[PDB]
């Protein structure tokens, strides 16, 4: 405005875009080089003179934070001799007119001659004030739903929003939160814009009735809902009862004259009364079917449960990327999924990050829901395809591993699409615009190690929330409509639903107090596994004939030991489980009818019958031994010999088999038979057993087509094969990402495309054909893919002693103990 | 019914398939009960009841006879050793002998036999499969070119194609350890010499593309140097005629596993980066006899004194 001079800005993001398609580079086939984003609009800029290049001012910034390499094809530039330097092709002159802009916050990876050659600008403190930064949020604010909604009633709102909160009391209600305990907390300045977006939004959402009240009502209201709304954003990753504890603080510092903020407080509006006070105590019942034990699409209503949905779907509704935090077991990414995909607006796109996900698997993944459409207002776009919003599930963001000078290269992308609503692509070298794809993620806290502490760039412009254990009792609840599903089978024990969930939970709970990482760092109890015990009841219970109450107490007990202690060392630890197992009984049992429940004590197996039942142990010996017997005379002839801890082995082995995800850790030391016992017992069930022939070259592409063809013969041809994976056969972190993936997921996510995709879905028509099968739906045929191998895929891990790294980074890895 | 069961033995043993032979067993078995109790008593039922009932019998081993596996040297030691006889030796190159020759050997009893064949045919399959892929992969697979000022064709994104090629020499190379695979040793051997001469052939393609691209982007347009070095243009102009001829006549091939067919191919190829080198070390005589007509150019470097 002061010089009347145009200005051109381009603002590129460093370690998002690579020197190959920044700079551009000669193709190794002709020695052509490729243009490159910055050489691009440079070329641009300077040759062609048909835009206003003299007149105006050229404004390039770097918003990532930059390292030598990359202006080590800048210093030149950023020499005075002005002159670009290509590695190949003539050299570009830059003008005066072409300035240069760099952010960041770190300067560990800047060589001071940069710092010599560049001008630094600092900021040691706040640009401005908090009451400066809201006041300029709600203008924002105010500018973006004027153009959309009507305007006097926008400004009778907006009247009330300045009247209703004043700064002086938000001062305070700021520093005390600043007096409180946060998980990837970042100072209150960050989550203000939160705060104030999502109170707008949801204000704006309650328009219609806004006409026909008493002002003095909607001041109240008005009143409630910013409250709310700072609750929510300000303390979203509070403990909970530290939520409380704020909640009391605002109500106290927060005007009184208003309608008083409650913990469990939500308006239920209705169009048949000015329904605006507040309401809590809503929970409705549920019933359930028995077979719905494991589908994980299945989630429980509690309190914690429904406000956690409310508060997710309005901060959605907000338009604001949000990040999830919370404990291994805190349940966040099937909750999720219940709460995104009834939705009758979004739509589901569950992305797993690895160790290192690249970019355009990212594109891709949009791809298969948006498309390409060439606008005027931002040239190509990829808005969505179909009418109900696109969010994508990203998951586990702390896992990617930074670069050789840190930071995370897709992380800085999410950055771009959810700040800049876009981003460049990279052959056409031209800025596209994203249409309201909202970026969600979940990611346990930094605390557990293995987890980068996140960038504040990235937190800041998000929303964090935090979801604990939900307590002790409302797992109580959950466990007990399970009980009771479960007990769907059986009706002769209905009124007994009480009794197990409550010992359940007590157990799990004095699991959790006994065992900690201070033993050895896998002591982790969740409710995943209380989960997978009532599914193993479930099964147990369903292949089994009528149990007396005496046999269902042995075989919860049964389960009990398989979920819980068979990760357990020592002899001490094993017997103060089983007196643990003892008082919890003795507590919430009144029957007084077992005998021994020790795990030489119990013996229940489907392989001596077609019935799951406690069994003999000479009758089992004996079966093993003629199994064993045959195997000497067909399968390899290795002098071994029985014993009860072998047996017992077995028993765990076949359970874990018999399962639907036969996903299997076993942990011990060498030579004792793990490796062959395990092909023991899939013989047993008449599986098939592949296993990774490595070397010491054997890159990710061996790994690769095994993997694949594993698959193919489950899927083409469902040979129910078993996969054997030792310590030896992981060297690599490549194959290991691989196998991280295909646990936490169910099917290859880089491969399925083109001709493997193509063969892929004329698979899955010839086998739905040669099944008799009507199914051709394609995400259905995904899911019906997933399905199968899920079924039909069993890997066993045998691994050396713990104390090994590669070992230690085997039980430390997420997904595998998860 | 009985016709049909008489019609499913005569049928060929290529156009017997193990689906059709289910489906038609299946439609048997359902029809038998439809009898009426005549034609039970009559010997009609009992004779298609009992053969039904054995090639229920043997399903399995059909199942595993008809993979692709089985070669006609299989089913000629099969008849030999099992049946004690022999079928025409033109029906049995293209499988057409019929289901009975089949049954007639007791394949039941002869489980064991079939089964060792069965297993080494397969053994021999592993690499018969993956001689297919080559063979129909390798068959077409040309390279894409363009044009650069109106000039030679050069090949697009090569160099993908050329690991393909390499990779495919990999496991040809690898699946020469096999238990049952002296069938097509000749075949082998055959496959083995076309894929050398080809990776030769693209191993210097690379080199000689590499090097007429370099010198093209010396000589050929810029009169100076041309008539700097007459001799060497003159020769790197006719190296650029004929190695244009050369992939025209690869290009309307259509076939790169043929192209080691054309006469005075690989000849060509070994002359014309021979003289490639040859120029391009007198290029660098000639750059470094200026260099030292003029010392400050050394400063300069090759592109900017080119
Ligand atoms: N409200 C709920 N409804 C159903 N299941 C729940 C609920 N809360 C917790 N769970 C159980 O607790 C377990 C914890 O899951 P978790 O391992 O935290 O998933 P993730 O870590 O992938 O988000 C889940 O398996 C789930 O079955
Ligand atoms: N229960 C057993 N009885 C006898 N020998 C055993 C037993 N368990 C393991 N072995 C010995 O271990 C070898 C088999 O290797 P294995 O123990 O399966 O390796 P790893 O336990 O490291 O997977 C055999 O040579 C055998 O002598």
């Given at each position: 405005?002061?010089?009347?001079?145009?200005?051109?800005?381009?603002?590129?993001?460093?370690?998002?875009?690579?020197?190959?398609?920044?700079?551009?580079?000669?193709?190794?086939?002709?020695?052509?080089?490729?243009?490159?984003?910055?050489?691009?609009?440079?070329?641009?800029?300077?040759?062609?003179?048909?835009?206003?290049?003299?007149?105006?001012?050229?404004?390039?910034?770097?918003?990532?934070?930059?390292?030598?390499?990359?202006?080590?094809?800048?210093?030149?530039?950023?020499?005075?001799?002005?002159?670009?330097?290509?590695?190949?092709?003539?050299?570009?002159?830059?003008?005066?007119?072409?300035?240069?802009?760099?952010?960041?916050?770190?300067?560990?990876?800047?060589?001071?001659?940069?710092?010599?050659?560049?001008?630094?600008?600092?900021?040691?403190?706040?640009?401005?004030?908090?009451?400066?930064?809201?006041?300029?949020?709600?203008?924002?604010?105010?500018?973006?739903?004027?153009?959309?909604?009507?305007?006097?009633?926008?400004?009778?709102?907006?009247?009330?929003?300045?009247?209703?909160?004043?700064?002086?009391?938000?001062?305070?209600?700021?520093?005390?939160?600043?007096?409180?305990?946060?998980?990837?907390?970042?100072?209150?300045?960050?989550?203000?814009?939160?705060?104030?977006?999502?109170?707008?939004?949801?204000?704006?959402?309650?328009?219609?009735?806004?006409?026909?009240?008493?002002?003095?009502?909607?001041?109240?209201?008005?009143?409630?809902?910013?409250?709310?709304?700072?609750?929510?954003?300000?303390?979203?990753?509070?403990?909970?009862?530290?939520?409380?504890?704020?909640?009391?603080?605002?109500?106290?510092?927060?005007?009184?004259?208003?309608?008083?903020?409650?913990?469990?407080?939500?308006?239920?509006?209705?169009?048949?009364?000015?329904?605006?006070?507040?309401?809590?105590?809503?929970?409705?019942?549920?019933?359930?079917?028995?077979?719905?034990v494991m589908?994980?699409?299945?989630?429980?209503?509690?309190?914690?449960?429904?406000?956690?949905?409310?508060?997710?779907?309005?901060?959605?509704?907000?338009?604001?990327?949000?990040?999830?935090?919370?404990?291994?077991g805190?349940?966040?990414?099937?909750?999720?999924?219940?709460?995104?995909?009834?939705?009758?607006?979004?739509?589901?796109?569950?992305?797993?990050?690895?160790?290192?996900?690249?970019?355009?698997?990212?594109?891709?993944?949009?791809?298969?829901?948006?498309?390409?459409?060439?606008?005027?207002?931002?040239?190509?776009?990829?808005?969505?395809?179909?009418?109900?919003?696109?969010?994508?599930?990203?998951?586990?963001?702390?896992?990617?591993?930074?670069?050789?000078?840190?930071?995370?290269?897709?992380?800085?992308?999410?950055?771009?699409?959810?700040?800049?609503?876009?981003?460049?692509?990279?052959?056409?070298?031209?800025?596209?615009?994203?249409?309201?794809?909202?970026?969600?993620?979940?990611?346990?806290?930094?605390?557990?190690?293995?987890?980068?502490?996140?960038?504040?760039?990235?937190?800041?412009?998000?929303?964090?929330?935090?979801?604990?254990?939900?307590?002790?009792?409302?797992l109580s609840?959950i466990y007990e409509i399970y009980y009771?599903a479960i007990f769907?089978?059986?009706?002769?024990?209905?009124?007994?639903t009480?009794?197990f969930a409550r010992a359940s939970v007590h157990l799990y709970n004095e699991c959790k107090?006994?065992?900690?990482?201070?033993?050895?760092?896998?002591?982790?109890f969740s409710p995943r596994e209380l989960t997978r015990l009532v599914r193993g009841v479930y099964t147990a219970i369903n292949?089994?004939?009528?149990?007396?109450?005496?046999?269902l107490i042995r075989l919860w007990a049964y389960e009990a030991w398989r979920i819980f202690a068979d990760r357990l060392?020592?002899?001490?630890?094993?017997?103060?489980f089983?007196?643990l197992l003892?008082?919890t009984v003795?507590?919430y049992?009144?029957?007084?009818?077992?005998?021994?429940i020790?795990?030489?004590?119990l013996?229940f197996?489907?392989?001596?019958?077609?019935?799951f039942?406690?069994?003999?142990?000479?009758?089992?010996?004996?079966?093993?031994?003629?199994?064993?017997?045959?195997?000497?005379?067909?399968?390899?002839?290795?002098?071994?010999?029985?014993?009860?801890?072998?047996?017992?082995?077995?028993?765990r082995?076949?359970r874990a088999?018999k399962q639907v995800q036969?996903?299997?850790?076993?942990?011990?030391?060498?030579?004792?038979?793990?490796?062959?016992?395990?092909?023991?017992?899939?013989?047993?069930?008449?599986?098939?057993?592949?296993?990774?022939?490595?070397?010491?070259?054997?890159?990710?592409?061996?790994?690769?087509?095994?993997?694949?063809?594993?698959?193919?013969?489950?899927?083409?041809?469902?040979?129910?094969?078993?996969?054997?994976?030792?310590?030896?056969?992981?060297?690599?972190?490549?194959?290991?990402?691989?196998?991280?993936?295909?646990?936490?997921?169910?099917?290859?996510?880089?491969?399925?495309?083109?001709?493997?995709?193509?063969?892929?879905?004329?698979?899955?028509?010839?086998?739905?054909?040669?099944?008799?099968?009507?199914?051709?739906?394609?995400?259905?045929?995904?899911?019906?893919?997933?399905?199968?191998?899920?079924?039909?895929?069993?890997?066993?891990?045998?691994?050396?002693?713990?104390?090994?790294?590669?070992?230690?980074?085997?039980?430390?890895?997420?997904?595998?103990?998860? | 019914?009985?016709?049909?069961?008489?019609?499913?033995?005569?049928?060929?043993?290529?156009?017997?398939?193990?689906?059709?032979?289910?489906?038609?067993?299946?439609?048997?078995?359902?029809?038998?009960?439809?009898?009426?109790?005549?034609?039970?008593?009559?010997?009609?039922?009992?004779?298609?009841?009992?053969?039904?009932?054995?090639?229920?019998?043997?399903?399995?081993?059909?199942?595993?006879?008809?993979?692709?596996?089985?070669?006609?040297?299989?089913?000629?030691?099969?008849?030999?050793?099992?049946?004690?006889?022999?079928?025409?030796?033109?029906?049995?190159?293209?499988?057409?002998?019929?289901?009975?020759?089949?049954?007639?050997?007791?394949?039941?009893?002869?489980?064991?036999?079939?089964?060792?064949?069965?297993?080494?045919?397969?053994?021999?399959?592993?690499?018969?499969?993956?001689?297919?892929?080559?063979?129909?992969?390798?068959?077409?697979?040309?390279?894409?070119?363009?044009?650069?000022?109106?000039?030679?064709?050069?090949?697009?994104?090569?160099?993908?194609?050329?690991?393909?090629?390499?990779?495919?020499?990999?496991?040809?190379?690898?699946?020469?350890?096999?238990?049952?695979?002296?069938?097509?040793?000749?075949?082998?051997?055959?496959?083995?010499?076309?894929?050398?001469?080809?990776?030769?052939?693209?191993?210097?393609?690379?080199?000689?593309?590499?090097?007429?691209?370099?010198?093209?982007?010396?000589?050929?347009?810029?009169?100076?140097?041309?008539?700097?070095?007459?001799?060497?243009?003159?020769?790197?102009?006719?190296?650029?005629?004929?190695?244009?001829?050369?992939?025209?006549?690869?290009?309307?091939?259509?076939?790169?596993?043929?192209?080691?067919?054309?006469?005075?191919?690989?000849?060509?190829?070994?002359?014309?980066?021979?003289?490639?080198?040859?120029?391009?070390?007198?290029?660098?005589?000639?750059?470094?006899?200026?260099?030292?007509?003029?010392?400050?150019?050394?400063?300069?470097?090759?592109?900017?004194?080119?």
């Amino acid at each position: 405005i002061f010089d009347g001079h145009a200005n051109v800005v381009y603002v590129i993001d460093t370690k998002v875009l690579t020197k190959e398609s920044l700079y551009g580079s000669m193709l190794k086939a002709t020695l052509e080089w490729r243009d490159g984003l910055f050489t691009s609009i440079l070329r641009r800029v300077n040759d062609d003179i048909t835009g206003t290049f003299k007149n105006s001012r050229i404004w390039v910034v770097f918003d990532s934070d930059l390292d030598p390499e990359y202006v080590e094809a800048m210093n030149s530039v950023l020499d005075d001799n002005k002159i670009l330097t290509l590695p190949n092709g003539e050299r570009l002159p830059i003008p005066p007119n072409f300035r240069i802009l760099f952010e960041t916050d770190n300067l560990d990876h800047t060589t001071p001659a940069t710092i010599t050659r560049c001008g630094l600008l600092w900021f040691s403190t706040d640009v401005c004030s908090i009451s400066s930064k809201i006041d300029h949020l709600l203008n924002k604010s105010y500018e973006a739903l004027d153009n959309k909604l009507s305007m006097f009633e926008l400004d009778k709102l907006k009247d009330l929003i300045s009247d209703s909160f004043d700064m002086a009391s938000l001062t305070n209600i700021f520093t005390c939160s600043n007096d409180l305990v946060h998980i990837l907390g970042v100072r209150t300045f960050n989550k203000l814009e939160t705060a104030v977006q999502l109170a707008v939004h949801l204000i704006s959402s309650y328009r219609q009735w806004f006409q026909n009240l008493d002002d003095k009502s909607l001041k109240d209201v008005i009143t409630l809902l910013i409250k709310r709304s700072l609750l929510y954003a300000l303390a979203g990753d509070s403990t909970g009862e530290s939520q409380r504890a704020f909640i009391q603080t605002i109500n106290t510092y927060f005007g009184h004259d208003s309608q008083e903020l409650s913990d469990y407080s939500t308006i239920v509006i209705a169009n048949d009364k000015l329904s605006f006070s507040s309401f809590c105590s809503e929970i409705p019942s549920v019933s359930l079917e028995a077979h719905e034990v494991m589908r994980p699409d299945i989630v429980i209503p509690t309190i914690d449960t429904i406000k956690h949905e409310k508060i997710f779907y309005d901060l959605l509704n907000s338009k604001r990327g949000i990040i999830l935090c919370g404990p291994p077991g805190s349940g966040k990414t099937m909750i999720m999924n219940n709460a995104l995909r009834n939705s009758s607006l979004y739509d589901v796109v569950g992305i797993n990050f690895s160790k290192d996900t690249t970019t355009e698997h990212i594109l891709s993944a949009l791809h298969r829901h948006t498309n390409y459409v060439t606008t005027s207002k931002g040239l190509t776009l990829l808005p969505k395809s179909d009418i109900k919003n696109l969010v994508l599930f990203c998951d586990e963001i702390n896992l990617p591993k930074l670069d050789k000078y840190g930071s995370q290269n897709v992380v800085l992308f999410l950055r771009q699409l959810m700040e800049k609503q876009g981003f460049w692509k990279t052959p056409e070298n031209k800025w596209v615009t994203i249409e309201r794809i909202h970026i969600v993620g979940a990611c346990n806290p930094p605390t557990d190690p293995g987890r980068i502490p996140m960038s504040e760039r990235f937190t800041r412009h998000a929303a964090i929330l935090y979801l604990g254990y939900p307590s002790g009792k409302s797992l109580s609840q959950i466990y007990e409509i399970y009980y009771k599903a479960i007990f769907k089978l059986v009706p002769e024990f209905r009124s007994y639903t009480e009794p197990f969930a409550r010992a359940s939970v007590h157990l799990y709970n004095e699991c959790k107090a006994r065992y900690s990482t201070g033993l050895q760092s896998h002591y982790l109890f969740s409710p995943r596994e209380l989960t997978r015990l009532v599914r193993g009841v479930y099964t147990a219970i369903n292949t089994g004939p009528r149990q007396t109450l005496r046999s269902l107490i042995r075989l919860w007990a049964y389960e009990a030991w398989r979920i819980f202690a068979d990760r357990l060392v020592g002899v001490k630890e094993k017997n103060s489980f089983e007196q643990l197992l003892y008082e919890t009984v003795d507590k919430y049992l009144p029957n007084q009818d077992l005998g021994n429940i020790s795990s030489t004590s119990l013996l229940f197996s489907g392989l001596l019958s077609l019935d799951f039942k406690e069994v003999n142990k000479t009758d089992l010996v004996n079966f093993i031994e003629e199994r064993f017997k045959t195997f000497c005379d067909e399968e390899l002839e290795v002098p071994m010999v029985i014993h009860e801890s072998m047996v017992d082995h077995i028993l765990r082995i076949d359970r874990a088999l018999k399962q639907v995800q036969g996903h299997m850790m076993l942990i011990g030391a060498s030579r004792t038979g793990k490796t062959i016992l395990t092909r023991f017992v899939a013989w047993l069930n008449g599986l098939k057993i592949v296993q990774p022939k490595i070397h010491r070259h054997s890159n990710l592409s061996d790994f690769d087509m095994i993997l694949k063809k594993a698959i193919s013969d489950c899927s083409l041809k469902e040979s129910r094969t078993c996969l054997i994976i030792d310590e030896s056969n992981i060297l690599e972190t490549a194959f290991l990402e691989r196998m991280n993936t295909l646990l936490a997921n169910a099917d290859i996510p880089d491969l399925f495309q083109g001709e493997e995709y193509d063969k892929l879905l004329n698979n899955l028509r010839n086998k739905t054909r040669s099944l008799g099968l009507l199914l051709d739906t394609e995400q259905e045929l995904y899911d019906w893919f997933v399905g199968e191998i899920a079924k039909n895929l069993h890997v066993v891990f045998t691994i050396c002693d713990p104390t090994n790294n590669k070992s230690s980074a085997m039980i430390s890895s997420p997904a595998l103990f998860n | 019914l009985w016709e049909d069961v008489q019609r499913t033995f005569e049928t060929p043993w290529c156009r017997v398939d193990v689906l059709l032979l289910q489906s038609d067993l299946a439609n048997f078995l359902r029809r038998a009960d439809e009898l009426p109790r005549a034609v039970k008593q009559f010997e009609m039922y009992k004779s298609l009841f009992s053969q039904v009932n054995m090639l229920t019998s043997v399903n399995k081993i059909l199942v595993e006879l008809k993979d692709g596996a089985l070669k006609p040297r299989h089913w000629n030691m099969i008849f030999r050793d099992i049946g004690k006889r022999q079928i025409q030796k033109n029906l049995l190159d293209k499988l057409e002998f019929s289901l009975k020759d089949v049954m007639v050997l007791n394949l039941t009893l002869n489980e064991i036999l079939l089964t060792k064949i069965i297993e080494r045919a397969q053994k021999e399959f592993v690499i018969e499969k993956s001689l297919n892929r080559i063979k129909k992969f390798w068959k077409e697979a040309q390279y894409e070119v363009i044009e650069h000022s109106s000039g030679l064709k050069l090949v697009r994104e090569w160099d993908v194609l050329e690991q393909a090629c390499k990779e495919d020499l990999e496991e040809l190379v690898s699946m020469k350890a096999s238990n049952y695979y002296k069938i097509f040793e000749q075949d082998c051997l055959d496959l083995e010499s076309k894929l050398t001469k080809l990776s030769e052939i693209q191993v210097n393609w690379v080199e000689v593309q590499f090097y007429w691209l370099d010198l093209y982007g010396i000589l050929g347009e810029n009169l100076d140097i041309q008539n700097f070095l007459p001799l060497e243009t003159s020769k790197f102009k006719s190296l650029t005629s004929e190695y244009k001829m050369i992939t025209t006549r690869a290009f309307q091939l259509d076939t790169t596993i043929e192209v080691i067919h054309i006469p005075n191919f690989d000849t060509t190829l070994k002359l014309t980066i021979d003289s490639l080198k040859m120029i391009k070390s007198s290029l660098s005589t000639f750059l470094e006899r200026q260099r030292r007509q003029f010392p400050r150019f050394y400063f300069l470097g090759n592109d900017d004194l080119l």
